[PDB]
Structure 1
Amino acid sequence: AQKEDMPPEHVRKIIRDHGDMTNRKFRHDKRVYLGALKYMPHAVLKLLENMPMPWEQIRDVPVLYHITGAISFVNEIPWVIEPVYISQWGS
């Protein structure tokens, strides 16, 4: 057993369904939805830490998302060669 990356469009079919509480897919399964919301501010960090870079047009990142689209963490740490980073900011 191992963890594999679901197709990128799968999370999009959850967000559209999870636009509001009105959707009838999730009315009684609330103990699993809102429970993850306590970790929401943490997520706000993980993307501002991995925020796309001025020379980077598209910043593809690994994303760890809840099965109900309640949260979407940026499951990465922006490790950068620091001399390269300083040279790039010099340019």
Structure 2
Amino acid sequence: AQKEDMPPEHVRKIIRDHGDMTNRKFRHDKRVYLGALKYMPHAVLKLLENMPMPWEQIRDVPVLYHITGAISFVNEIPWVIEPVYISQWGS
């Protein structure tokens, strides 16, 4: 019993709609939306620590996002080989 990954277009659509809270269609359930918003600093911390390095053009990262698009987390720790990382930054 493991959660299968969703297509990247699913979260794209979820973010694209429900953008403004003024819509009254999804206002019925907001405790699930509001309760997951306190972890915004966690999303900030995970996002900035996975910032791409100057030698990298595009960095695809695993993403853990709320079912309503309330918050998105970068579920990845930037592990780097120390000699490789130091040599890359020296270059």
The TM-score, its normalising length taken from structure 2, stands at: 0.96
Q: How far apart, in 2, do the equivalents of 1:22 and 1:10 lie?
A: 22
| Unpaired runs of at least 5, structure 1 | none
Q: How far apart, in 2, do the equivalents of 1:9 and 1:28 lie?
A: 25
Q: How far apart, in 2, do the equivalents of 1:53 and 1:39 lie?
A: 25
Task: Give the strand-richer structure, 1 or 2.
Answer: 1
In structure 2, relative to structure 1, the CA distance for the partners of 1:17 and 1:25 (3 Å cut) is farther
Q: Conserved in 2, the CA contact under 8 Å of 1:17 and 1:23?
A: no
Displacement after TM superposition at 1:68 (Å): 0.2
Stretch deviating more after TM superposition (43-52 or 20-29): 20-29
Query: 1:11-44: CA deviations, max 9, x gaps?
Result: 0111111211123331110010011000011100
SS of residue in 1 equivalent to 2:37:
helix
**2:51 corresponds to:** 51
SS of residue in 2 equivalent to 1:87:
helix
In angstroms, what is the RMSD of aligned CA positions?
0.8
Aligned length: 91
Q: Conserved in 2, the CA contact under 8 Å of 1:14 and 1:69?
A: yes
| Unpaired runs of at least 5, structure 2 | none
Q: Conserved in 2, the CA contact under 8 Å of 1:11 and 1:69?
A: yes
Q: Conserved in 2, the CA contact under 8 Å of 1:37 and 1:70?
A: yes
SS of residue in 1 equivalent to 2:26:
coil
Stretch deviating more after TM superposition (23-32 or 79-88): 23-32
The TM-score, its normalising length taken from structure 1, stands at: 0.96
Runs of 4+ residues deviating >4 angstroms: none
Displacement after TM superposition at 1:86 (Å): 0.3
